[PDB]
């Protein structure tokens, strides 16, 4: 919309083709993380943490 | 249920406690008495009300 397009025009801000779907804590929960477990698909590459 | 016991305990007529039939001048000084331990709750007296 042309208001935001003008906000793009002032500051040159370029929000990319990337969109957020981050898994977050349900708000109102305290505690401590006791495991991270990874299930990767077959044949597909693996990363430095897993 | 709770108050209806405590009202019944408050207003009662036990013939024996202390100060049977003594004189009083006001319900203020009636509460001078029970809060001092120098009388009881349920014991008959001779009073004045307005």
């Amino acid at each position: 919309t042309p208001e935001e397009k003008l906000l793009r025009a002032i500051f040159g801000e370029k929000a990319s083709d990337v969109k957020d779907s981050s898994l977050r804590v349900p708000n109102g929960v305290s505690g401590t993380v006791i495991d991270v477990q990874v299930f990767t698909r077959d044949g597909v590459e693996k990363d430095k943490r897993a | 249920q709770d108050v209806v016991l405590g009202l019944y305990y408050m207003t009662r007529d036990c013939v024996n406690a202390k100060g049977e039939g003594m004189v009083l001048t006001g319900p203020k000084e009636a509460e001078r008495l029970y809060r001092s331990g120098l009388a009881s709750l349920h014991a008959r007296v001779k009073v004045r009300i307005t």
Binding site: - | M22, V23, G26, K28, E29, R32, R35, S36
Partner: protein
């Protein structure tokens, strides 16, 4: 140990015998404490003078009657309990009470001296029915604290008193009825602490606020062995009710108070229009208007500029 001492905020006094004295805030566990720890003082341990002994002529006991009197002897004994008194310097005063006339017997009828102080003179002690009979009694005043009724008083007075001498339940303490409470109090993140609300009504012969001073001393004295812009400032020098501070400032291109306060009186007075007597007409201006030597002005000049 960084304890939250309180400040008393308020007294809500109704009349000259009554008050509600609130408070905030305390910690939890001291609000319930103090509001009880004073109530054990105002019942049993506040020293005052009260009516103790009663002597009427022509009587035998209080179950009897007296003609010429509307009431019973007990109701006349009742009134002296509701009577208020103050003996100043003595420690045992005896008074008298003799009347005639058709009507009531108010508390002016006591033959007093200057050291016994009745606060309530309208207090009726008897009613004469017809003109014929009359009341002539003698009453006795003693000093103590708290309350002792005549039941256990005669258990503690083993005197074989002769017939005609009566004894009332003495009212030594001045507190008639007090009560207290605990609501919640807040400090702007902690909404857990407790205020103190105290309701208090006493008799006369005292201030209703004087007791909480007086009685809370006594608990503490027990513990001493245990703690051991302006409008004419928008206006040039010709209109400020003065005239040798007007004509000689505009000839240095300061037509107003504006650059007068920034510029220094060692040079502005050194110009050929002011001098060593102008400081009485600048520094006295800067006394009431507060501006300084060299000050930065927030918003001095409007669009209007003019002269005379």
């Amino acid at each position: 140990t960084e304890f939250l001492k309180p400040r008393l905020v308020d007294i809500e006094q109704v009349s000259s015998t009554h008050a509600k004295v609130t408070l905030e805030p305390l910690e939890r566990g001291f609000g319930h404490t103090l509001g009880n720890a004073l109530r054990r003082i105002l019942l049993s341990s506040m020293p005052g003078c009260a009516v103790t002994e009663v002597e009427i002529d022509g009587v035998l006991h209080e179950y009897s009657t007296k003609e010429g009197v509307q009431e019973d002897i007990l109701e006349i004994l009742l009134n002296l309990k509701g009577l208020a008194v103050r003996v100043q310097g003595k420690d045992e005063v005896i008074l008298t009470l003799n009347k005639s006339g058709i009507g009531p017997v108010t508390a002016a009828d006591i033959t007093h001296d200057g050291d016994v102080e009745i606060v309530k003179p309208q207090h009726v002690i008897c009613h004469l029915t017809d003109e014929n009979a009359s009341i002539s009694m003698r009453i006795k005043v003693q000093r103590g604290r708290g309350y002792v009724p005549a039941s256990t008083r005669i258990h503690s007075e083993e005197d074989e008193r002769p017939i005609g001498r009566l004894l009332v339940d003495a009212c030594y303490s001045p507190v008639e009825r007090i009560a207290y409470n605990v609501e919640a109090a807040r400090v702007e993140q902690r909404t857990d602490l407790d205020k103190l609300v105290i309701e208090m009504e006493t008799n006369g012969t005292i201030d209703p606020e004087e007791a909480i001073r007086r009685a809370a001393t006594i608990l503490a004295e027990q513990l001493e062995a245990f703690v051991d812009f302006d409008p004419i400032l928008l206006r040039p020098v010709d209109d400020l009710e003065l005239v040798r501070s007007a004509n000689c400032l505009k000839a240095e291109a300061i037509h107003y108070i504006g650059d007068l306060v920034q510029r220094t009186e060692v040079e502005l007075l050194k110009t050929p229009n002011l001098g060593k007597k102008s400081l009485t007409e600048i520094k006295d201006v800067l006394a009431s208007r507060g501006l300084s030597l060299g000050m930065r002005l927030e918003n001095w000049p409007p669009a209007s500029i003019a002269d005379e």
